């Protein structure tokens, strides 16, 4: 129902510029905050920027501060991200996500290739091989107490991240009951009771007790 179509990415030389545009539809765009979150090749998710509602107020990550500029056009229901002085480190897949703390809807991601503290989250294991019907357990540990401000996201290969659990344990509307999130403080676990063939994906844990919100490196679930 809710669509977030991204465009504007591609391949650029170091020092160049790009403009990413995420056209949203299916919700009151002017009522929600919007965010850009990037994923480096073979790395975890990283929060880039957010624009809040009717405040014209921007929040940026320290690595992209001064170089990136987020903006929104409420008449077009579009979220723009102007990337300037692009470095080699900026090469990643950029997703536009809804809201500022709990990202319920994500874009499919657009690739940007450039060529010629806060709370840290650790997930366990980094990868695992299980069969259909098994019970899998993923552990998310926070460097400090984050209360119950924990989210679990499911990212299938090459697809957009999907919100599974929010506030440590509350299940997202539309998520099967086989998913269960539990834990508090600094220790959280995501358990899948009976694995399914479509369930093989990478699972990420995010915290929003501290801004900027940080993710884990991810937990890959493969076949045997």
Author numbering: 3 to 118, 134 to 241
Publication excerpt:
The M2 is a proton-selective ion channel, and it plays a pivotal role in the uncoating of the viral core during entry and viral assembly. M2 ectodomain (M2e) is a potential universal candidate for monoclonal antibody therapy owing to its conserved nature across influenza virus subtypes and its importance in viral propagation. We selected a 10-mer conserved epitope of the N-terminal region of the M2 ectodomain as SLLTEVETPI (labeled U1) used for screening against the Tomlinson (I + J) scFv phage libraries. Four distinct clones (AU1, GU1, JU1, and UU1) were obtained based on changes in the CDR regions.
To facilitate crystallization, an extended U1 peptide with five additional amino acids were used during the process to improve scFv-peptide complex crystals. The co-crystals of scFv AU1 with extended U1 peptide crystallized in the P212121 space group with five molecules of scFv in the asymmetric unit. Of the five scFv molecules, three are unliganded, and organized as one dimer and one monomer. Distinct CDR orientations in liganded scFvs allows accommodation of the peptide at scFv interface in the form of a wider groove with extensive scFv-peptide interactions. Interestingly the two peptide molecules are present in parallel dimer orientation at the interface of the two scFv molecules. The residues Lys100 (CDR VH3), Arg102 (CDR VH3), and Tyr107 (CDR VH3) of scFv (monomer B) formed hydrogen bonds with both the peptide molecules.
